[PDB]
Design a protein around this ligand. Structure first.
Ligand SMILES: [Fe+2]
Ligand SMILES: [Fe+2]
Ligand SMILES: [Fe+2]
Lengths: 112, 112, 112
């Protein structure tokens, strides 16, 4: 029906998890320089980000069917699950920011 | 198995987004009278509500697969996403009520 | 690609609703002893828990596609819907704990 809509420069919105992972990647392979040799590889395959931190292990950040969308598999802090609260990604278990976590775990790996 | 259940006047529950859109429509095509000629059409196609406000443009309210269920496409305030908090629909971005928004945008369109 | 992952004792995570229902069942068929003859049966069919409380009726606890995952059908307090807040299951309508509800409804059935 509504002709007035489809004459706009329309676009489908992004998956809100997709927006974060893309932002995470470039803000991680820019951080893959300030490694001594300690955060060698970042790779976003196809909705799956893999991070290698040889001190801790292999990270897996994952885009997941609901019951809340972003999946953390940390070889240090274990698994966790995140969805939107007020625009940042938040743990279903305790309420901790996803960003805040790999902030610590990366800046510990660089330090140690 | 459990025979005691299926002798009740059973019914499948409604989609909680469906309950809102139905309530929104009649509470909008009742509001499509107090237009000068300024909020001409409301139409709920099949899970898609279309609102025409010629001042701003064509609105689209939409029922969306999870990562949170009701989708706002406002030609004035942009796009947004809503799910249940304590029984009212709330923006994933900032936390604003969906009802509270098209309250303003309609009562501005009538005013101006 | 990432060889370091798949040499771990890997396992797929559980459905967070599944973890609760399993915990609910054994913590209910242990409670199906301290009935006079008043909470006779508990049964978890296949993602569907059925509770018979002859005073009130037949309960149905249910695992549901998102727009929030655990479904309560109480013959006393009506229907409700639950998802994770800070690690416990919470009503979309009002914000009440799922655990807190069948706590009351069971310990009323034993009492009365
Ligand atoms: Fe892992
Ligand atoms: Fe639009
Ligand atoms: Fe029932």
């Amino acid at each position: 029906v509504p002709q007035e809509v489809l004459n706009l420069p329309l676009e489908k919105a992004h998956e809100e998890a997709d927006d974060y992972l893309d932002h995470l990647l470039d803000s991680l392979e820019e951080l893959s320089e300030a490694h001594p040799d300690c955060i060698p590889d970042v790779e976003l395959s196809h909705g799956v980000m893999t991070l290698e931190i040889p001190a801790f292990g292999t990270y897996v950040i994952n885009k997941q069917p609901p019951n809340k969308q972003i999946w953390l598999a940390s070889p240090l802090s274990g698994p966790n699950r995140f969805d939107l609260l007020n625009g940042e990604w938040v743990s279903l278990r305790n309420g901790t920011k996803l960003t805040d976590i790999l902030t610590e775990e990366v800046e510990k790996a660089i330090s140690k």
